[PDB]
C-alpha cells in the first residue's frame with residue numbers, strides 16, 4: 770500500500786496515450802490505449818464490445834501518420850472498465866516500432882543507480 774503498489778508484472782509498461790482499435794472476427798471497435806509493453810497491451814472497454822472473451826482479439830495502434838502497428842492479442846483479464854491483453858504474436862516491423870517507442874521513452878543515461886540496477890532483477894544480468 771506504500772511504494773510497492775503490489776507489483777506483479779516484472780517491469781512496468783511504457784505508458785503513453787494514443788488511439789487503438791481492436792478487431793475480433795467480423796467485428797471492429799474503437800478504443801483508447803492506456804499503455805503497452807513489448808508483449809502486452811491495456812485498453813478501455815467500449816459499449817459495442819460484442820465479442821467472446823474466449824476468442825482471440827487483434828489490436829492496431831496508430832501513433833505517427835505513417836506509423837501503423839499490428840499485434841495479435843488474447844484477453845488476459847478485465848477489471849474496472851479497463852481490459853488487459855497478452856500479446857500472442859506481433860509483426861516483425863511492429864516489434865521494431867515498439868522498440869522505437871521504448872528507446873525514446875527510455876531517454877538516456879541517468880543516475881539513481883538503483884533504478885538502473887533494477888534491470889538486474891529481470892534480464893540482461
Ligand SMILES: Nc1nc2c(ncn2[C@@H]2O[C@@H]3COP(=O)(O)O[C@H]4[C@@H](O)[C@H](n5cnc6c(=O)[nH]c(N)nc65)O[C@@H]4COP(=O)(O)O[C@H]3[C@H]2O)c(=O)[nH]1
Pocket residue numbers: 774775776777778779780781782845846847848851853
Ligand atoms: N489481471 C491483471 N490485471 C491487470 C494487469 N495490468 C493491469 N491490471 C489491472 O488494471 C489496473 C490498472 O492499474 P492502475 O490501478 O491504474 O495502477 C496500478 C499501477 O500504477 C500499480 N501497479 C500494480 N502492479 C504493478 C506492477 O507490476 N508494475 C507497475 N509498474 N505498476 C504496478 O498499482 C496500481 C494498482 O494496480 P491494480 O489495483 O491491480 O489495478 C490494475 C489492475 O486492476 C495484468 O497484467 N493482469
Ligand SMILES: Nc1nc2c(ncn2[C@@H]2O[C@@H]3COP(=O)(O)O[C@H]4[C@@H](O)[C@H](n5cnc6c(=O)[nH]c(N)nc65)O[C@@H]4COP(=O)(O)O[C@H]3[C@H]2O)c(=O)[nH]1
Pocket residue numbers: 776777778782804805806807808809810811812845846852853854855856
Ligand atoms: N502491457 C501490458 N501487458 C499486459 C496487460 N495485461 C496483461 N498483460 C500481459 O499478459 C500477462 C498477464 O498475466 P496474467 O495471467 O493476467 O497474470 C498477471 C497477474 O496475475 C499479475 N499482474 C501483473 N500486473 C498486474 C497489475 O497491474 N495488477 C494486478 N492486479 N495483477 C497484475 O501478474 C501476472 C503477469 O503475467 P505475465 O503474463 O507475466 O504478464 C502480463 C503481460 O505480459 C496490460 O494491461 N498491459
